[PDB]
């Protein structure tokens, strides 16, 4: 709710994903998706950024 984000993004995809990850992991993944958007120099964050952060987090 705090970020800009896009309509395309399926949060429920990451919800149903079996990986056991803390809310710490969740704040980190939102932060990293935002940072990926900043690297592309856009404030809107896209689902591809969520994917990249998701594989960035966990291990």
């Amino acid at each position: 709710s705090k970020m800009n984000l896009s309509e395309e993004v399926d949060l429920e995809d990451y919800v149903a994903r079996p990986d056991k990850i803390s809310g710490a992991d969740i704040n980190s993944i939102c932060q990293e998706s935002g940072m990926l958007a900043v690297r592309e120099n856009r404030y809107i964050v896209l689902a591809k950024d969520f994917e990249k952060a998701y594989k960035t987090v966990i291990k």
Binding site: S22, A24, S28, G34, M35, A37, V38, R39, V57
Partner: protein, 368 residues
């Protein structure tokens, strides 16, 4: 007929220079003498106010008193716990002071890394850039974080094999940022008297808090950062809850280095802190070439030197090793009395570094 024109002219010039040095003697002998008519104010720390002119102060390991403002001290600038200096005679507060003390934290804040630059890093590109994503942007441009709607990250862990410029990237970051910096040896943190490690880290982090923007960097965090004698574990706790729990506003970021990321306590590795973990791998063949050329310019290298032979012979070398090569090449040069270095000197240096490497064989290192 220049004698009368020049003798007294030079006399007056010399006497005026003598007057200028004797004025320095006069000003020093008067300034330190009027400094002599002074008394050391007692140093201590304030407690609750009672009135606009009544304040409780603890006078360090001595007793505690109640005293009042001299005339010119802002009452609002006094808070319970603010550090103050008081008159020896009447103990009334002569001045407030910048909070907290400690020579050790000064020594942690007044060591210089030397001259380094991001171009003087062995082409860790992504890695370096990621560390700039976690620090450079949060400090210089928090507005982008605010506009995106994310909180700037706090910290990153350097890990991977040793000798891969473990300290070097931090040295570069420190030398390329105009902010307060705190290098600390993790093993230098811990001390015997029980609780000095925790209190020392406390003072270090209060220093960083009161000197924003600041970058605290711990090298070899696995010294105390391992999974849970027990005093080390309590020190880890002190870190572990100082590192989040009271607030997060800080213009302060922590960089950590480890030769053993696996043993690090999982609590640290938590994503909220340790916001990223940057693996600084064993340098690639192209990366090794990059490092070679980076440590090549200042050499008095001579004729033409074909680096790719070094590269394909230096497979599996840690970036650091490459420096050795160059030094050893000059050794051959000093054993040849050359003011230069030739390709085959580099070949000899590479083969001797290979000779040394077998004794230096890689650790039983496990990454995450």
């Amino acid at each position: 007929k220049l004698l009368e024109h020049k003798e007294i002219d030079g006399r007056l010039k010399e006497l005026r220079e003598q007057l200028k040095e004797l004025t320095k003697q006069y000003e020093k002998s008067e300034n330190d003498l009027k400094a002599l008519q002074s008394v050391g104010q007692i140093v201590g720390e304030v407690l609750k106010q009672l009135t606009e002119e009544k304040f409780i102060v603890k006078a360090t390991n001595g007793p505690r008193y109640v005293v009042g403002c001299r005339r010119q001290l802002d009452k609002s600038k006094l808070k319970p716990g603010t550090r103050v200096a008081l008159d020896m005679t009447t103990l009334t507060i002569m001045r407030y002071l910048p909070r907290e003390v400690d020579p050790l934290v000064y020594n942690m804040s007044h060591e210089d890394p030397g001259n380094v630059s991001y171009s003087e890093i062995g082409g860790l590109s992504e890695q370096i850039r990621e560390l700039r994503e976690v620090i450079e942007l949060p400090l210089t441009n928090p507005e982008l974080f605010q506009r995106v709607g994310i909180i700037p990250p706090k910290g990153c862990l350097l890990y991977g094999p040793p000798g891969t410029g473990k300290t070097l990237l931090a040295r570069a970051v420190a030398s390329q940022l105009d902010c307060n910096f705190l290098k600390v040896v993790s093993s230098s943190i811990v001390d015997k008297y029980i609780g000095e490690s925790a209190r020392l880290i406390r003072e270090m982090f209060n220093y960083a808090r009161d000197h924003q923007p600041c970058i605290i960097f711990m090298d070899e965090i696995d010294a105390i950062g391992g999974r849970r004698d027990r005093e080390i574990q309590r020190t880890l706790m002190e870190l572990l809850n100082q590192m989040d729990g009271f607030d997060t506003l800080h213009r302060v970021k922590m960089i950590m280095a480890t030769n053993r990321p696996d043993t690090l306590d999982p609590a640290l590795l938590r994503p909220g802190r340790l916001d990223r973990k940057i693996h600084i791998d064993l340098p690639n063949e192209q990366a090794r070439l990059d490092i070679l050329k980076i440590h090549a310019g200042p050499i008095t290298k001579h004729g033409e030197i074909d680096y790719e032979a070094i590269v394909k012979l230096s497979d599996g070398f840690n970036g650091a090793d490459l420096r050795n090569v160059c030094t050893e090449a000059g050794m051959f040069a000093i054993r040849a009395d050359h003011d230069f270095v030739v390709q085959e000197d580099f070949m000899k240096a590479v083969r001797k570094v290979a000779d040394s490497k077998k004794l230096e064989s890689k650790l039983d290192y496990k990454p995450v």
